[PDB]
Design a protein around this nucleic acid. Structure first.
Length: 195
DNA sequence: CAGCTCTGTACGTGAGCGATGGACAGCT
DNA sequence: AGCTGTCCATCGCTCACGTACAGAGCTG
């Protein structure tokens, strides 16, 4: 067993709650919660996931944080959390086309409410669907980083990063993703100097 | 033909897991 | 000196909130 006696079937019935507030700077949008997040009730508890490590190596967090700290982030730092698909999935390749499109609609309504300065898509696959469904734009070479469109009727920017999951071989280490988190830290700073 | 879409497949790290064995202490 | 167990170091192994790209099958 990997979940201390809790069956994987029980975990798929559990959900992970969003941590959203008004006047946030950053909203971290994951694909869908995984088995460990459903179990813990916290964001990115995967012992090999790069999220908390990249958030420190980049300087967004001044100390080395963990999943139990996610609830302190909206007030201490200005970071929020939400997901494209709400349902617990053991992987991104288990989700269906309809599910993501249902999620894209429910996600855009959330962003139009809370209105963060930057919406961070923790995964490229979810921006592919979102761009097509919300902006009617399907481009050949989709890239990471700052995107050209703002969330409809808001001033929220769209930032895309490789998934913090250790699954992708194209960015094998946390060190290989850290660059996007630093460039995100710069965008937050550039925007915070509005005056 | 040229450009598009949908789908199948391969790819690097490092963390946790269960199996295994060598060190070492306690007892004859 | 012989025997027996526990502790822990370590091996082999799988897996993680994906990504990119080749190719078949469309379509203009």
């Amino acid at each position: 067993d990997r979940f201390n006696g809790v069956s994987e079937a029980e975990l798929l019935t559990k959900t992970l709650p969003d941590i959203l507030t008004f006047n946030l700077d950053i909203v971290i949008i994951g694909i869908a919660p995984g088995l460990m997040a459903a179990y813990k009730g916290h964001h990115y508890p995967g012992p090999g996931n790069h999220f908390w490590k990249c958030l420190f190596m980049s300087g967004l967090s001044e100390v080395q944080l963990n999943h139990m700290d996610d609830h302190t982030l909206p007030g201490k730092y200005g970071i929020g959390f939400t997901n494209m698909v709400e349902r617990t999935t053991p992987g991104s390749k288990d989700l269906s086309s309809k599910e993501f499109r249902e999620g894209g609609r429910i996600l855009v309504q959330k962003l139009q409410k809370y209105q963060p300065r930057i919406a961070v898509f923790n995964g490229k696959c979810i921006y592919e669907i979102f761009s097509k469904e919300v902006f009617g734009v399907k481009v050949k070479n989709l890239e990471f980083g700052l995107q050209p469109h703002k969330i409809p009727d808001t001033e929220t920017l769209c930032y895309v990063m490789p998934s913090s999951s250790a699954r992708c071989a194209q960015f094998p280490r946390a060190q290989d993703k850290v660059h996007y988190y630093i460039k995100l830290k710069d965008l937050r700073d550039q925007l915070k100097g509005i005056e």
